[PDB]
Design a protein around this ligand. Structure first.
Ligand SMILES: NC(=O)c1ccc[n+]([C@@H]2O[C@H](COP(=O)([O-])OP(=O)(O)OC[C@H]3O[C@@H](n4cnc5c(N)ncnc54)[C@H](OP(=O)(O)O)[C@@H]3O)[C@@H](O)[C@H]2O)c1
Lengths: 262, 263
C-alpha cells in the first residue's frame, strides 16, 4: 500500500523520493515514492494511471498549472494560486491541493525568519504566485516584481498587491527569490547587490546550488537567510499528511533531502 | 494521532469502534475510533468539530442524508444514492463518500457469491438503494421489491431498475434482504420459503441475529448464503483505506465485529 510519486519534466534529480522514503520509514509505514518523468502533454494519461494505482502524487514543472482542468476537485487556495502541487486519489477521484503556500509559511516560522514586511517577492510566475498568496494570507504588505512588468502588474491587481521596481528592494524587509535565476548558476542573481536592504531577511526557493549568489549577497549584507530546503521539506511533509493523515518530521525530511543532494 | 468516529443516533451498539480498533492496531497505527451520539439537530455543530479535529468519520442514521448539503464535495455514487456513510477531512475541507455500495460488492466477491443475476433487492429504503445501485454498475440485471409498491417502481425509474412482485423472487439468482424484517426476530422473514429461488444465492444485511430466518430458509433450499458481516467489514476497511490509504484485513474486521457481537 501507499504508492506515491512526483510527476514532472524534468524530475531526474528530484529530492522528494529521498524525503518521502524517510517519511515512510520514520512513520513505520510500507510504501514507495518514485520519480516518474511526465511531459505536459502526457499528463491526461498519467492522471488516469494515478487514479488506478497511486494514493497520491506531487506535481512539478510544468504540470502544476495544467492539472486543474483534470481533477474532480481543486481547493480554494490551489484555484486562486492557479497551481496544484499535491494530488490525492480516493475511489479513483482526484483532488488537487497546494502545499507550497502553507509549506513556505511553516518553513519561515520553523526557520526563525520573522514575518516582517514589506515583503518583496521576485518573480510573478508559478512559485511567485504561491509565495505571494501565502504572504498575503499572513497579512503582510506584499510587493511583487517580475522581469516582464505585465505579469507583476497583473498579479498585483489580481491579488490586491503592489507591483514595484527592483529598486524598492531596499525598502523591503523580507526578500524572496521565486524566479529561476541562479538555478545551477552561481554567477547569476535576480537582484543586483547594491539594491539589497541592510536589515531584514532573504529566502531563496532555488536550492541548486544551495548557497546561491542571491543568498550569498543577502548574507553579506547581514540579512538572516534561509535556503530552499526548508520550504521543499514542509510542502512535502504537508503533502504526506494530506495523503495519510500523518505528519512526518519536517526537519528529518529536510536532512534527508540534503543527504540526497550530496 | 489519527482521530476517527462514528456519528449517529444511536451508536451505542455500532460495531465500528471494535473493527477500526483492530484496523489501527493491526496496521501499527496510533489513534482512536469512538462512537459519538449525534442527533440530527447536531450534525452542523458536529461536522464543524470534524473539519477541525478528525481525519474522518463514518455516518449512520439519521445523518446519512442531511450530510450532503453540508459537505464541500460529495462523490457521484453518494450523490445518486443520496447518502454518505464516510466523510474525509483534509485541510479543513470535508468530502463525502459511500463505502456501502462498493463494500457490498467486495464482500460478495470475497465470499464466493457470483454476481450472476438476475438479482432481486427486497426493500427500496436507504439500505436497498445502496445495494440496488452497486449491483447494476457491477453488470447484472436487477429487480426491486418493496412492501409499498410505489417506493419500488420509483426506484426502478430513478436508478433504471425493474419493480417486481414478491413472486418474482423465484426467478432470481441473487437475493438480497434490505428490509428490517428479521432484525431481532429469529422467526420472521420477508420472503416465504415457497417463493425462494430455484438456484442461486441470498445475502441478508441484517446481522442481529447473525443467522436470520431468511438465511436459514435460503440455505435449506440449497442457495449459497452470506451474512451481513462481510459487507459491514468491507465498507469499514474501505473507509479506513479512504482515510489513510491503508486497507485493514477485511477478514480481521469481521472477526472483531463477531467478537463484539459475542456470537
Ligand atoms: N524550494 C521549493 O520548494 C520551491 C517551490 C517552488 C518553486 N521553487 C523554485 O523557484 C523557481 C520558480 O519555479 P516556478 O514553478 O515558479 O516556475 P517558472 O515558471 O519556471 O519561473 C517563471 C518565472 O521565473 C522568472 N525568470 C526566469 N528567467 C529569468 C531571467 N533570466 N531573469 C529574470 N527573471 C527570470 C520569470 O520571469 P518572466 O515572467 O519575465 O519570464 C518568472 O517570474 C525555480 O527555480 C524552482 O525550482 C522552489
Amino acid at each position: 500500500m501507499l504508492r506515491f510519486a512526483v510527476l514532472g519534466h524534468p524530475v531526474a534529480h528530484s529530492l522528494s523520493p529521498a524525503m518521502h522514503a524517510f517519511a515512510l520509514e520514520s512513520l513505520g509505514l510500507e510504501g514507495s515514492y518514485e520519480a516518474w518523468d511526465t511531459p505536459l502533454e502526457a499528463l491526461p494519461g498519467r492522471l488516469k494511471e494515478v487514479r488506478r494505482a497511486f494514493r497520491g502524487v506531487n506535481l512539478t514543472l510544468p504540470l502544476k498549472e495544467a492539472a486543474l482542468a483534470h481533477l474532480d476537485w481543486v481547493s480554494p487556495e490551489a484555484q486562486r494560486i492557479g497551481a496544484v502541487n499535491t494530488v490525492l486519489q480516493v475511489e479513483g477521484r482526484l483532488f488537487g491541493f497546494n502545499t507550497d503556500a502553507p509549506g513556505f509559511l511553516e518553513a519561515l516560522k520553523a526557520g526563525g525568519i520573522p514575518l516582517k514586511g514589506p515583503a518583496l517577492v521576485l518573480g510573478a510566475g508559478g512559485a511567485g504566485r504561491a509565495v505571494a498568496f501565502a504572504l498575503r494570507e499572513a497579512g503582510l504588505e506584499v510587493w511583487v516584481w517580475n522581469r516582464t512588468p505585465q505579469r507583476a502588474l497583473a498579479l498585483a491587481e489580481e491579488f490586491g498587491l503592489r507591483a514595484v521596481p527592483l529598486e524598492k528592494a531596499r525598502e523591503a524587509r523580507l526578500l524572496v527569490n521565486a524566479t529561476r535565476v541562479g538555478l545551477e548558476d552561481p554567477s547569476a542573481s535576480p537582484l543586483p547587490a547594491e539594491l539589497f536592504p541592510e536589515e531584514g531577511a532573504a529566502v531563496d526557493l532555488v536550492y541548486r546550488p544551495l548557497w546561491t549568489r542571491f543568498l550569498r549577497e543577502a548574507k553579506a549584507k547581514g540579512l538572516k537567510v534561509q535556503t530552499g530546503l526548508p520550504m521543499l521539506a514542509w510542502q512535502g511533509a504537508l503533502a504526506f499528511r494530506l495523503w495519510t493523515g500523518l505528519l512526518p518530521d519536517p526537519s528529518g525530511m529536510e536532512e534527508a533531502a540534503r543527504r540526497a543532494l550530496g
